Design a protein around this ligand. Structure first.
Ligand SMILES: Nc1ncnc2c1ncn2[C@@H]1O[C@H](COP(=O)(O)OP(=O)(O)O)[C@@H](O)[C@H]1O
Ligand SMILES: Nc1ncnc2c1ncn2[C@@H]1O[C@H](COP(=O)(O)OP(=O)(O)O)[C@@H](O)[C@H]1O
Ligand SMILES: Nc1ncnc2c1ncn2[C@@H]1O[C@H](COP(=O)(O)OP(=O)(O)O)[C@@H](O)[C@H]1O
Ligand SMILES: Nc1ncnc2c1ncn2[C@@H]1O[C@H](COP(=O)(O)OP(=O)(O)O)[C@@H](O)[C@H]1O
Ligand SMILES: [Mg+2]
Ligand SMILES: [Mg+2]
Ligand SMILES: [Mg+2]
Ligand SMILES: [Mg+2]
Lengths: 483, 482, 483, 483
């Protein structure tokens, strides 16, 4: 817990003035560019490629979990979360009276006192609930985990005696029930704070009503900012009951708890909320934000976003015979085969390296991509063909495919490439130099100039000029290279 | 929302000692009841200088928080007040000496000194009103804002009743007569804290059994109004025809003592036009009609249109703004929107949302015409029918509405957010287009410093076109070094 | 009842150290020596006899309220209250987190090897509930009220932000149920603390199961020292659940809340709890203290307790022709008349004194006492005869009987007293003598010498005595009267 | 208790090598060193001597609840409990994942002909059982809530999801029904894990066989380690069936359920198991332990255990007039009246101290011991006389006697000690008067003159003059008072 003494700032908005829970948050000015400052990528040096195959394979296997590239939706979602969190605190000011007394005083002052008019609207504050919908693998969880890391989870105050829980995350389990969510709420709260609410409130004897009341009480004890319930797809409609009962429980939970609630799910989870979204009555809530794959055709032009994403990842290939330019057909094949879904796009790039490391030459070709698509990514065929077809019901049915058990498959592929003793000509050429630190110059000089006299002339020149930097001897080698 | 009751007197002699009527906000004149509904956004000059995404969000937040009270809301407010306060006169629970009074009256009529007597005042008048008008005219927001003045639940200390003042129901997209009964309980256990839906809304019950169960509950808490919204959405095939809906809506008024209000589209009146059972019961208190705004009702143009357009125009967030609104712009709005409330606001919002994307940042007639042509496609026949003026064509296309407008707003925001990136770096690489140059830059990015590396090589390429990449390396390296 | 800033003193006991809650309580040593100093009495003056009938009747009317004699059981109950209140704060010291961290730390330290052994004994200190059983009218409620008034109800901590509630009391009503107990807890908490919890939690939606959890959370929030449920005899038996459901509810309430709990009831309510405390299990809790009537005899001798109580009550005689000392016959018949019940002992005396004053033959004797017994105590005959019979089963059935509506009878008898106008010979002499000092002399010398020479001699003597007090005047009149 | 997170420690035995359940338990200890870990005593021995009598009585009443001293027979029981708990976990190893491949490889090799013999799997047969027999009052439960108090009850495993219930304790009922033994298992498992087994299984109408086949399924999901059944005497043909089914139920239970079972009973409960070789084979599966009272001497010289038990308890004496050392006559009388039963030794001490406080004598002699033995220990006399006799049959027939309701006697004695009175000097000065005349004169002349010399003057008036009437005495009394 980043327990920091509450240091209070000045906010431009008059509504957020003198609220001790909002000045404790990081300022907006530094959060303007923090949304776009989420970029993170691996750093590669020249000597990494010259090293042995095991470390190169390890670095290749480290790619999927160490690469992030933000998009426009990562900015829109960041701004939405910031405004939601900062607007959900306006009603819960400890320095001002509660809502019910305000309403009662207004009623007395409009009937007995002097006041021309009043608005008996719910003072519950904004509390804008939201529902995030997207196909599996689009990159929803990995975006929440990166845009919710700016705010510290727990902030401690000293003028009062409270502990502010800025956000809380609940992750569902497969084939769970409604009561499992209630248990997980207390479990996550005890993990975050270090309390013992689970023992005295998370017993299995309690009914749903008692657990909901206790959740409301405890969430109003510690000032809670946001509640995120992830992976709604795993809930089962057999034991829980009808889909109407699930919606009733979700609406009851949202109304009682009194804090902003965000739900993340797939289109298969939309059939539960279909009746709620279409109704236009205020108070139903659950605004919808849809995550979509990167469509290459916008306004009759290739996307600058698509090429920007592909070029950066194309710069991150560890190949001996790699092609610097990404051709139009090479760009098009691994879009038309993967349909732009976020995980499959990087899955091809990480798996084609492994396939090429054993199947022959170290070059990425369309045939190799087709072969890896056909032999490895078997379960995800219906989802990809549904996305290619473009019929919404077909995509809705064939979603949730997550190509199970890729973690063990990566390890098995690593073990498979581990037991290879054949020597490539490139390995022989690299071994012909005894770590003289000159295979780097040889690397820039191998793609065009022939190797008939490349290495002997290089060795002769570096022997003639023993102690200078490689930048100095590169013109020296080039002087007699063509003469 | 549990508000304790505070009693105040009213000048009406018919409501002398009624707690239900005396625990309500006081009676008001014409000016305040119509001027209390006004609401608008407040903007500051600091909002003008901000990032484009926040400005787009503020623009998209306009239709939710803007309301202008016209001259047709005063009548609706007055009628709703009369309906709510007049339906409680026969339901006051203060009956202290009824038994002795009735017994004395009976003992006196038998002897012969008293000719006649009235044992029970059967105050059971069925009051109702139906409000029909074209879609997009604002029958839902104009009702929410009127009803947001009374408290919903009032608690009386002396008694044990919870006076649920009003209740609102919305119909489903296909809909049947059973689901209205199922939604009554589902909204009543949301207004209060209860579990009526599981206890009473079973499947074993028929339509009549739930219709009779609703009466006991609506008389347990002194319900004051019942609003059924969007009767246009009901399907005439899953309900029983065009007659069993009318029978349902006429039997509903008689048994349930509360006043009811029915809201629909002009093509949904064909259900209700068959008989007096809703031409008299439904129009037991009139039938208010909503119409689009007319530009020139008299010889002079209407001041309502001018005031509405001016007040809408004063919420513009653009660097290049024109304070004076041109007459041609007014003509363009009246020609494209034809006075429908839902079209004017969307046209304005979409125009000033596309202005940021195109970068002009000024609203012109051509932009409004283009956004009307591009975005308002499904609602064209309704506009044409309103322009023609034939009642049948107006009735037939009265249910048109543009689908998926919110997704369009989100996509329009995303396009601007993608555009916003200035990209000060990589500008020289944008200037770099030749394949040989890009390969050379990739080769020499680590060796040299790119900032002065990129511009220099373009001159060398421009001077001598008939040179290859391989042979250019020594000369380019020599020029870079010295 | 009013907020008091906490003042931290020092306690000599080692276990009650560094605890904000215990040190803020009143000091232990001062309370020890003042446990038997709660004795109160309605003081009388020598001049009170000389005033009229109405004023003296009004003065006699105040005896049942302005009198309290501390008996043996009062000290034991005081000690039990003290230990129960101050022993339940050991496990809730704010300086240390809780016992779970202690248990985990001990487990880790014994697993590592630095600690030989650890006792997972579930340390809870005393943590014992108490059950009070006694016949109606024994005087439990008054003693409890007078012993709980020493501790201030609410003390405010400024260094912390908690509201210590030292005790809380709940009073039942006729034919009540459990939900009234749950709601009355909140109502009493609002009346004592000064905030509004009834309007937020007193909702008809909640069942009793959820209300108990809310009670537990709120009580743990405020550090509730002690909970006293009173007059459980009044609530109906079969209206709620019968016998098993009420016992189950009481056990659940005792287990969940975690603060000391006391119950007060009649022997007729003991059969609810007979199934629990009779089992030979010292860890089941529910210790019992039995209240018993005062016994005249002890190991063959009259106990000093009853004799001292009767003497102190007889010291307050206010009557015209009353006797001086207490006779053996009247004292012995008083035991058969009242049988030791606290209410009957004082009420018989008050009623007999009032009747003697009203009759005009004011001298309380055995016959007047018996007449009052058979006149006013008709309803409570079965309880008295069952208690005198000594059958342990019949006393339980009639233990709930109580004298109905006696307050109105006192007013009616006072109105009857005000109606009389006849003048007794003592009142005739009172009208004859103007000086109150002379009236006292007449009163003390009334029985030895009759008014044949009494009134004239003292009248002329005090008339001729110009100005002097009684101290030397009385000896001077003695020889003149004797001559 | 409570969900303690597991921390693994290695075990030196080869067979316990890789079992999480065995490793999460507290480390192995030597038998001699483990028996000394059970000792406990009161810490208030000298600091609390000078205080009021009721507080001292309240302190004394807690001697038989917090004083425990191990004997030489506890180390064997501790070793047996440890071996029984840890040795029943070898067949329940959860951490195995290479079974399928190994079994299939063995099958292939034995089918081809490379390998001759193989062993696939074997089921477990029977669980260890133990029997403990001894007379009542010997300490078979106080000495076993402390052996099992050095273990956690519930342990949570992070990598798995099992909650290892280390042990569980249930008691038989007076009815002896076989359906209330399968119904306390669920209740005791619910009172520890906070689960809902009793509603799901017990309340439905199931046969004893079906409900016994469900007790071995929830004792496997939670890796239960030991099951203790107390008061096994109550199945001696008490009710509910015939002897043959009552004997078949235990055999089927031991055969079915996988956990070890321990049985505790009275010397009249070996007739149940001494009926056929199956019952005596299963009751004495891991030895049988028979317990006997303490003897004064074994071979000539007196027992040292008696000396150590009657010397570490005599120190806990809160009396002003105590003796430093034990007179041998007092100890001999104590052994004559106690005969070695654990319960009688403590009670003859606490009751003697309470009577000493009540009567005002602050020292303990043999007379008080004999008086308490004759008065307050009537119901257990046949057992003590049979033990003194020496005939084994009379000892065996009276091994079930127990004294009921001694806590009520303790409370009554505390009340008697509380009600002693203070004898304030003014009341005793008034009590010095021995006639109605002196009291009459004092009451007549109390207010006029000071009471500092009133009593001596009145006493001297009657002392100097033998007797004469009060009316003429009063002029002399006032003359003496004035001068
Ligand atoms: N904007 C992005 N830039 C780079 N990689 C991304 C991006 N979004 C998602 N990914 C990759 O997609 C992979 C899988 O995403 P995942 O968290 O499984 O999405 P979901 O939880 O919706 O299935 C992650 O390993 C992550 O590296
Ligand atoms: N008087 C008004 N002033 C401003 N906006 C209005 C007014 N009346 C309606 N609107 C706009 O019309 C939009 C839709 O109206 P709605 O209530 O949906 O009408 P209907 O229910 O008949 O379709 C609302 O977003 C609201 O902003
Ligand atoms: N020690 C005492 N001295 C004087 N009066 C007493 C004493 N104990 C009880 N009383 C009398 O008992 C009455 C109250 O009895 P109460 O406590 O209500 O009995 P219960 O609790 O059984 O209903 C008071 O009016 C009081 O005068
Ligand atoms: N080793 C011991 N030291 C001191 N007291 C003991 C010891 N063993 C037993 N006792 C006493 O024996 C009393 C009764 O034991 P109990 O649990 O009733 O055994 P059982 O149930 O076999 O009769 C307890 O109060 C306890 O104080
Ligand atoms: Mg996910
Ligand atoms: Mg509408
Ligand atoms: Mg009472
Ligand atoms: Mg026992």
């Amino acid at each position: 817990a980043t327990r920091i003494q509450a240091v209070y700032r000045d906010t431009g908005v008059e509504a957020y003035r003198d609220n001790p829970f909002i000045e404790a948050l990081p300022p907006l000015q530094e959060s303007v560019n923090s949304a776009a400052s989420l970029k993170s990528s691996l750093q590669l040096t020249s000597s990494d490629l010259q090293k042995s195959r095991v470390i190169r394979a390890h670095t290749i296997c480290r790619i999927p979990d160490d690469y992030f590239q933000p998009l426009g939706t990562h900015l829109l979602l960041s701004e939405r979360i910031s405004v939601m969190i900062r607007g959900g605190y306006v009603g819960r000011n400890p320095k001002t009276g509660d809502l019910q007394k305000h309403l009662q005083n207004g009623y007395e002052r409009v009937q007995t006192g002097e006041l021309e008019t009043f608005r008996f609207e719910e003072a519950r504050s904004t509390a804008q609930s939201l529902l995030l919908i997207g196909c599996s693998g689009s990159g929803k969880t990995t975006s929440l985990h990166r845009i919710l890391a700016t705010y510290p989870q727990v902030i401690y105050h000293r003028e009062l005696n409270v502990e502010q829980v800025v956000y809380l995350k609940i992750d569902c389990s497969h084939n769970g029930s409604l009561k499992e969510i209630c248990l997980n709420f207390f479990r996550a709260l005890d993990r975050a704070l270090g309390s013992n609410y689970e023992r005295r409130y998370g017993l299995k004897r309690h009914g749903i009503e008692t657990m909901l009341a206790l959740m409301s009480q405890i969430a109003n004890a510690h000032a809670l900012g946001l509640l995120v319930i992830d992976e709604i797809q795993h809930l089962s409609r057999s034991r829980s009951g009808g889909s109407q009962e699930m919606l009733n429980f979700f609406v009851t939970m949202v109304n009682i708890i009194g804090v902003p609630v965000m739900l993340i799910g797939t289109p298969k989870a939309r059939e539960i909320f279909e009746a709620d979204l279409r109704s236009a009555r205020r108070g139903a809530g659950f605004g919808a934000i849809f995550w979509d794959p990167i469509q290459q055709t916008q306004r009759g032009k290739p996307n600058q976003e698509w090429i920007a994403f592909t070029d950066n990842l194309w710069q991150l290939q560890l190949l001996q015979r790699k092609d610097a330019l990404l051709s139009d057909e090479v760009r098009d094949v691994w879009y038309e085969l993967s349909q732009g879904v976020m995980d499959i796009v990087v899955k091809l790039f990480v798996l084609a390296q492994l396939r090429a490391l054993a199947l022959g030459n170290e070059r990425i070709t369309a045939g190799l991509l087709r072969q890896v698509y056909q032999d490895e990514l078997k379960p995800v065929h219906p989802m990809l063909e549904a996305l290619r077809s473009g019929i919404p019901e077909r995509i809705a049915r064939y979603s949730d495919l997550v190509v199970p058990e890729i973690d063990k498959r990566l390890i098995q592929l690593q073990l498979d490439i581990a037991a290879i003793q054949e020597q490539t000509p490139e390995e022989k050429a690299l071994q012909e130099l005894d770590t003289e630190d000159q295979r780097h110059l040889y690397l820039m000089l191998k793609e065009d100039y022939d190797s008939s006299l490349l290495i002997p002339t290089i060795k002769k020149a570096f022997s003639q000029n023993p102690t200078m930097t490689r930048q100095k001897l590169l013109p020296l080698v080039l002087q007699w290279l063509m003469e």
